[PDB]
Amino acid sequence: LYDRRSIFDAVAQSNCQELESLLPFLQRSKKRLTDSEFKDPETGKTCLLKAMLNLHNGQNDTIALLLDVARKTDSLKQF
Numbered sequence: 001l002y003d004r005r006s007i008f009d010a011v012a013q014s015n016c017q018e019l020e021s022l023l024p025f026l027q028r029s030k031k032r033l034t035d036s037e038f039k040d041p042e043t044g045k046t047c048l049l050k051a052m053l054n055l056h057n058g059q060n061d062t063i064a065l066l067l068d069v070a071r072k073t074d075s076l077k078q079f
Contacts, residue, residue: 011051011062023069034075
């Protein structure tokens, strides 16, 4: 299982492992990386955007994984 907080922390430290079980989670719950619940309720920030702020050496592959997940559910464009 994953809440907003869980992923945002993973992203903060460029961890591509804690997101191993990610894709299969919102396959079961059919939740979308774009759901109301996966954004900050007052800014509209998403994990991809958290990743965009949490750069280390202009790099983050949580991005590459995060995008990849969004196409597999094709949240892709709006994500």
